[PDB]
């Protein structure tokens, strides 16, 4: 399985990939480009790359949690298990760094050129930090020293703590992957952002906790510091760590100090720093929360806003209370607490989708009418698109006796009433339709129609009907029969 | 009253129901579907169901407050009154669980199918938790033991505390009911959300308070914990509870610690947990508050935003100060601090409503004119819709001498002035109208008209007039008389 | 000056009044309505009423600050100066209450009817609270007692503290006045709201401070409370008050406790209450601040948002970097970091204003052209409105050699260049104009035109020109000369 | 280099300047205006002025940090190094003040008039404060005294502290420069605002820290204050300062008190003040953070909001799940998680840019077609603009057998399929085009076309084609060949 590896290195055909590039042909074309250099180049959007980054993340998170703690609360830093772990981690990071040269960079089209583009762009931006993070600097220093001891040890811990610069790399990895996920799974951005922030906060809190003890460790546990003053120098490491974290955490969430307000200058300064870091983090969190909340009820909010405009309009015109109430009722019936521009949405969609939607809505309404049963399907489709949805309140005249009816109505739904002088009253319900006589007559409507309950009609204007006919002359002729 | 129960189980005809489904016929149809299975199925939107859920809520809230407190601050948990209360509660929850099988689930149309749909969908989602919550697990355990004592008792309390999982159920109930209420009463979403959050916070605070003491109780009141260190082990239960709540509450609202910063590890950890929980809750609350504030002054805000755009436009064109001032004045008069797209709003409404609105606005204006007194009502209605509202600043020429008047004006309101060379000056007020001579003439206007004070006209363009006439030829002919 | 008072009682002719009602005639009409009842009715929007409310506010604020403090930190509550002050205040509030019956209520049109409308609507809503607040209840109680002493005194303080219910009245007064001010002075809503909140917070803080000491006072200064534990029972009143306020204030802003965490139950409960009140207030403040911030940079924000959409569009089309840069540059030149729909704004304005704006913009541009010097002013005006503003980037062909020019260009501004094969190159600057030959020719354009620097043209389409001509045939004829 | 200075004083030709004024000619004109007065007037937007303000900022920031500290933590305020520094600073501020008279003020066009406009407008607004800040008042007072000592010294410090009023000036300088930068570099407003606030907070914190110690210093270190109670009167200055800052900083970020809750009244009051200042600042910061967060993910948010409307629409129409899924898929393919009104954006742009964009998009698509190879470039350009982008889901009929094709399709991209009864199946890919036969025929389409995979077409309607032809009759004729 030597070619398999190569294949993996190329960008695979996934849901994401298609969205990014297009069709499978496009993907293939991209792959061809990649295939110019053999075993030296890795495509950023590839599956192998993804796997590698996942691995890194798994390692990286652990390492970030571990490293500082290891440095602080374990005195014997030269013990076997620790050292082996460190070495392996370093190796992994070196490998990652190496990969980064071979990996392509997203911009615009992705640059797959190795010797000039990948090497120079990486070396001019992020390389140095990565290099620092990956390598075991402290160990190197120790080796150099080998080829005052307490002082050296103290120095070394600080050097080791340069391995926290992997965090930048981690962040970078996260960002790209999040972007990819957005393209793929349609994740809620707000949710993602807040989650990221939470993680960051946790990490920062941990670091602060470590640091608070770390400085004392560095300074040899002086008599006027928080570790010596609480009398927990020789206590179990875990307990100490917990205490430190608590101290840090309070500063993060604005609760208070540890045992006592700082005495030594250094300690005080550290506390202040933590507070600053804590405070800003909390602010950011609050902001994120606010954003999330706004996102969550957004549609609803929009509806309310829209309604407020109507209210304002009413106020401007100084309408009677009854009128206002009626309008409110209409709005409730008409839109059902929702906000959407129907027409705009339809425009945004393609034709087939639109047609499908219309069929779902109105095919049952128009098919029940005997005029459209014998007609051709295309004609029906054409008609249906034209139809315009309407609502009427109870005790409202839809059509009137003697007034010229510009449009005909199909009752999808609702309790209507046919007001006629000659024929008494024939109440109409869902499925019925009217204004049919006044289509090709081009005159005044005979009888009246009043809404008994709330109604949901589909209006069809005479002009629109004429337009529709314009395409189907045979159909028009047929209609003209009776 | 055996059939009455069945009826109740079906979905009733309410305001909500109509909105959900449609007309009474639709509701009846839905009921028919429900009526396929007798005494085994409950419709989610039914009145009986609503009542049941209300009952549950009444029970549930009480139980959530009570349970933890009971577990903690009362040592004798095997006493009669407590046990009876518990048993009844358990029974009620079991009944609720049973109902949940028989109750239909909202999706899309509601699934009323029992054997497959209701049983499998519920069992695959929420069942297990509900089952756990409902049953008295601790009591069962005790019974088993019956058919080291201190240890057993300690264990049992934890088991009992599994009955807090009713909270999920409660939440679910609340959400659905809130949704229903939205459909029904048009509640302010923001307000609802914040209220929910407040309740949650309170509950959480209470739980934290219980927990802080609870852990000490579990651990047998060790010498280095907050209960033993304050010397309030044998104090009255109520006082202790209050203290615990205070401790919890401080962490929630970021105030501080209890008597002293934690000493024992467990206590410290608990405190940290509380802080986390507290802090997040506070953040959420803040966010909600922000959202609410934004909602409350939204219309006003929108107006301001709109105005800012006008200002920006002015800036871009670098207008003189006087001009800007004039524009500002016009805006104030024109819109009166409000924001609304009139045309859009009108489009959103149905025809009858629109007509009514127009009548309310302009029937008094047009009726006072003697041209529209003898005319037909339909014609008048047609005319009125066409009319377009306008405002003019004082010292502004509305119509001019010698310039062709494209439109005529009805003064609804304001202090106008007729500038004529021959006839001196005849100042016009609310109710007057002009540009009437230049309607069918198709030429140049004779005299000028200047605004004395601010005005509110209803313009009527000649083209629009012609269009209107197009429908009523007789009317046009009549007009042509004089 | 008996009639003067009556006049004052009626609604005056102010800026506000006109905006509310309309013209002076409208105001007069309103006044007539008021004048139905003599010396018994007060119009809500009147000047006298405003004055009265200002007076009340002046009194009310003072009283709210004073009362609680007086109750708490002065033992001798039966001393002369205090009592006189109280009595006067009570009298004033009674007077205010009386006025409230006679004052009209805003709804819709304002209800000026006394016997039924004003009396019943007020008595069914706010009366009782107002009555309670106004009257000296404590004094009445004392009188009753006159016609254990320590106990009575304790009771009386609580009764007296019912006079804080004036706060509701104050709030009501503020709201109405704020609304009026909005109509009048165009105040920033956000700013207003935050200011209100600040005031409320301050008042609440003060009350909390009073309360914290007040409860101890009521309870006779027990040995385990914050006043007795700090050993400041017999200290100077002012100091005590300050301390109390500090204690309250910390809870409001989430800082901490007083000297020590509460010991007695009552104290603890009070603290908790304060924290709740404090915390909510702080949240509200934060929200308000956020809102204010959003308001302040709103225009700018909108522009950025708009730009982001353009960027997104570019991304979707996957444009080259150069192209993107060009677009960015164009946007910067075109809109200058601002957001406004020109056309929409113009539509919103009246005609005269629009004309004025156009003159300010383009009269200097078109007048310099010799074609429009001899023409009539009306024609010029007509032309100018039609003109459409445009921008061109340097190294861009505006007009081309051999391509049919649909529109002509007036260079308001910018460094243009005339590219001709025959006539070499004649560089054009601000004031010049071109495409003039291809107006009535209806053919292909001869020479090319390229932008040297950035340009700001006013395009005029041939169709639009034709339309303009349609009104002025003589003008057209004249133009046709040469 | 005497004229060089003059030149510098005039407004230079920068990117900013052009944007502000226009072309170089405009800038020159502006310069001419400036050149009316020689060596007495400075233009606000000039380079020299900018440099001066930068210098001031550099000085000013330092001075603000230094002054208070100097006043507080150094007893010997009459020492040489300090005094020299002070004197120089004072001189600089005096110079700045002088410049301010000579500098022009931005409004509208900038006022370059010296004797009336610059002198009176400055003297009526900001002068006095500036004068106070600039001059060494304390030193003057001392001199006066020269021409109880402890008391005098105490008084003098307060007087000296009047030199903090330079902050207003600094603020003013910052605002203007920020505005200029916005015009120039297109900075993110939100980011700027937050940065400003941070700086302010830091400064305020520092001042608070100084103040907390300062009051004690003024009051002669009484026995019941925080400096005397901690026993750090004779400690090193730096340590004291740090402690003070910590105390201040806690109040700012809501953490807690210093060593102990205040005892003396003055101290308590100071603490309260700090808390107020701190609390408000924190609120503001939170608000700013929220704003920033909203800005950052704005585009994404907008997309989500838009999508929610579609969902709402679907809900309203009660569509089947499959349909909804299809719609979602279409949206994902169609818009790719982005929001933009294409048409609106195009309208906003100029013609050349639009043309360029179209070429980038569709020239490759239309050029591959042999119909447009021999045609003229102008015609091609015209055609391309008309084209309308479309998407189709797999298993969707684009064109049908027997149905009249109103528009023709160019496959930019995607896996299509040609459904024919006679000719079997010929699958089409990127670059192909169809509906070409039904262009000038004006009849029914022969064969069907179904989407195999997702597609991205460019539709071209027959009406649009006809319109395009209308300009190029020769082209039309050519097309009519075959």
**Pair of tokens at residue A101:** 């040269």
**Tokens standing for B215?**
């852990």
B chain contacts of residue A334, beta-carbon cutoff 8 Å = 348, 350
Nearest CB neighbour to B254, from listed C182, C254, C287: C254
Structure-token pair, residue A34: 């990649």
Closest among D107, C187, C298 to B319, alpha carbons compared: D107
Helix ranges restricted to H, C318-392? 321-335, 342-348, 351-358, 364-368, 377-386
Question: Under an 8 A CB cutoff, do D356 and C282 touch?
Answer: no
Q: What is the chain B residue with the closest CA to A308?
A: B299
The answer to whether the beta carbons of residues D407 and D468 sit under 8 Å apart is no
Interface membership of C429 toward D (CB under 8 Å)? yes
Q: C108 vs A256: CB contact, 8 Å cut-off?
A: no
D residues 161-190 closer than 8 Å to C (CB)? 182-183, 186, 188-190
Give the pair of three-digit tokens for residue A175. 């960002």
Q: How was this structure determined?
A: cryo-EM
Q: Which domains does chain A have, with CATH numbers?
A: 3-289 (no CATH), 300-340 (no CATH), 363-480 (2.60.120.10)
Structure tokens at D79: 């020492």
Alpha helices (H) in A219-236, listed in sequence order: 226-229
Extract the tokens encoding A288.
């994120």
B418 φ, ψ to 5°? -90, 105
Resolution to 1 decimal place, in Å: 3.5
Q: How far is CA A468 from CA A20, A350, A474, D439, in A?
A: 41, 20, 12, 21
Chain breaks in chain B (C to N over 2.5 A) after: 107, 147
Residue in chain B nearest C345 by alpha carbon: B310
How many angstroms separate the CA atoms of B466 and B382, rounded? Answer: 12
Q: Which residues 254-283 of chain A have a CB within 8 Å of chain C?
A: 254, 256
Using DSSP bridges, classify how beta strands D397-399 and C448-461 pair: parallel, antiparallel or unpaired.
unpaired
C427 has a chain D CB within 8 A of its CB: no
Residue C187: both structure tokens together: 């105040």
* Tokens matching residue B411: 């003064």
In Å, the largest CA–CA distance within chain A is 118
Query: Nearest-CA distance from C65 to chain D in Å?
Result: 18
Provide the 10 A C-beta neighbour count for residue D46.
21
Report the alpha-carbon distance of residue D283 to residue D277 in Å, rounded.
10
Closest CA to C222 of C262, C253, C252: C262
C-beta separation of C364 from C304 below 8 A: no
Distance, CA of D223 to CA of A52 (rounded, Å): 66
CB-based contact B19 A453, cutoff 8 Å: no
The pair of three-digit structure tokens given for residue B440, joined into one six-digit string: 């069918």
Beta-carbon count within 10 A of A84 CB: 10
Flag whether residue A249 sits within 8 Å of chain B, measured between CB atoms: yes
- CA gap C230, D260 in Å, rounded: 13
In degrees and rounded to multiples of 5, residue D104 shows phi and psi of -80, 155
Q: Which helix (H) or strand (E) holds A73?
A: helix A47-73
- Identify which of D123, D57, D116 has the alpha carbon closest to the alpha carbon of residue D92: D57
CA atoms within a 13 Å half-sphere pointing along the CA-CB vector of A476: 11
Identify the three-state secondary structure at position C389.
Answer: strand
Residues of B comprising the binding site?
A: 435-436, 438, 445-446
Interface of D with B in 317-336 (CB under 8 A): 318, 320-321
As a dihedral over the C-alpha atoms of residue B380, residue B383, residue B388, residue B394, rounded to 10 degrees, the angle is: -60
Question: What's A363-403 look like in SS3?
Answer: HHHHHHCHHHCCCCHHHHHHHHHHCEEEEECCCCEEECCCC
Rg (CA), chain D: 37
For A186-207, give the secondary structure using H, E and C: CCCHHHHHHHHHHHHHHHHHHH
Interchain pair A286, D285: CB under 8 A: no
What is the CB neighbour count within 10 angstroms for residue B81?
Answer: 7
| Beta carbons of A297 and B189 less than 8 Å apart | yes
Give the span between the Cα atoms of A293 and A301, in whole angstroms.
11
Backbone phi and psi for residue C323, each to the nearest 5 degrees, phi listed first: -55, -50
Of the candidates B258, B290, B334, the beta carbon closest to that of C286 is on B290
Angstrom distance (rounded) from CA B325 to CA C417: 39
Q: Three-state SS for D424?
A: coil
Tell me the nearest-neighbour CA distance from C214 into chain D, angstroms: 20
Which residue in A255, A388, A453 has the most chain B C-beta atoms within 10 A of its own C-beta, making it the best mutation to test that interface? A255
The reply to whether D436 sits in an annotated binding site is yes
Residue with tokens 């695979």: A12
Distance of CA C62 to the CA centre of its chain: 27
CB A341 within 8 A of CB A444: no
- Cβ neighbours of residue B286 closer than 8 Å, sequence gap 6 or more: A286, A289, A290, C283, C286, C287, D286
B190-195: long-range contacts (C-beta < 8 A, 24 or more apart)? Answer: B190/A297, B190/A301, B190/B288, B190/B291, B190/B292, B190/B295, B191/B292, B193/A293, B193/A297, B193/B288, B193/B291, B194/B285, B194/B288, B194/B289, B194/B291, B194/B292
Q: Which of D251, D294, D299 sits opposite C255 (nearest CB)?
A: D251
Report the C-alpha dihedral over residues B380, B384, B385, B391, rounded to 10 degrees.
170
Where helices occur in A147-165 by DSSP H, the ranges are 149-160
Task: Tell how strand A407-419 and strand A433-434 pair up.
Answer: antiparallel
Residue pair D27/D46 in contact (Cβ under 8 Å)? The answer is no
CA distance B320 to chain D (A): 7
Select the residue from D279, D365, D471 to test the C interface by mutation, using most C Cβ atoms within 10 A: D279
Q: CB B313 to CB C342 under 8 A?
A: yes
Give the Cβ contact number of residue A281 at 10 Å: 19
């Amino acid at each position: 399985m030597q070619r398999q590896f190569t294949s993996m290195l190329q960008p695979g055909v996934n849901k994401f990939s298609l969205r990014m590039f297009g069709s499978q042909k496009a993907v293939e074309k991209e792959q061809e480009r990649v295939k110019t250099a053999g075993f030296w180049i890795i495509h950023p959007y590839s599956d192998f790359r993804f796997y590698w980054d996942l691995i890194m993340l798994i390692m990286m998170v652990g390492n970030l949690v571990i490293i500082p703690v290891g440095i602080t609360f374990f005195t014997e830093q030269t013990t076997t298990p620790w050292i082996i772990f460190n070495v392996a981690s370093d190796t992994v990071f070196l490998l990652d760094l190496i990969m980064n040269f071979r990996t392509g960079t997203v911009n615009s089209s992705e640059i797959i050129l190795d010797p000039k583009v990948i090497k120079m762009n990486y070396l001019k931006s992020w390389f140095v930090v990565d290099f620092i993070s990956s390598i075991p600097v402290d160990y190197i220093f120790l080796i150099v020293e080998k080829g005052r001891a307490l002082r050296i040890v103290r120095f070394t811990k600080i050097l080791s703590l340069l391995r926290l610069l992997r965090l930048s790399r981690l962040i970078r990895y996260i960002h790209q992957w999040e972007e990819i996920f957005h393209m793929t799974y349609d994740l809620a951005s707000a949710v993602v952002r807040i989650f990221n922030l939470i993680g960051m906060m946790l990490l920062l809190c941990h670091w602060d906790g470590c640091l608070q003890f770390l400085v004392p460790l560095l300074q040899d546990f002086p008599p006027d510091c928080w570790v010596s003053l609480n009398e927990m120098v020789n206590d179990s490491w875990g307990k100490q760590y917990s205490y430190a974290l608590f101290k840090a955490m309070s500063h993060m969430l604005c609760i208070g100090y540890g045992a006592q307000a700082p005495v030594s200058m250094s300690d005080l300064w550290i506390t202040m720093l933590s507070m600053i870091v804590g405070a800003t983090c909390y602010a950011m969190f609050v902001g994120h929360a606010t954003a999330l909340i706004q996102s969550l009820d957004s549609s609803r909010r929009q509806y309310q806003e829209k309604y407020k405009q109507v209210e304002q309009y009413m106020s401007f015109h100084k309408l009677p209370a009854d009128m206002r109430q009626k309008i409110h009722d209409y709005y409730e019936h008409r839109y059902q607490g929702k906000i959407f521009d129907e027409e705009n949405i339809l425009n945004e969609l393609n034709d087939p989708l639109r047609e499908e939607i219309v069929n779902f809505n109105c095919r049952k309404l128009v098919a029940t009418m005997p005029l459209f049963a014998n007609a051709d399907p295309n004609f029906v489709t054409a008609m249906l698109s034209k139809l315009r949805f309407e609502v009427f309140q109870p005790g409202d005249y839809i059509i009137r006796e003697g007034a010229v009816g510009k449009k005909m109505y199909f009752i999808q739904h609702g309790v209507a009433g046919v007001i006629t002088k000659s024929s008494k009253e024939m109440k109409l319900t869902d499925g019925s339709y009217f204004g049919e006589i006044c289509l090709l007559t081009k005159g005044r409507r005979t009888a009246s129609v009043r809404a008994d309950t709330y109604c949901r009609l589909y209006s069809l204007s005479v002009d629109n009907f004429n337009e529709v006919l314009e395409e189907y002359p045979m159909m028009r002729r047929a209609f003209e029969t009776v």
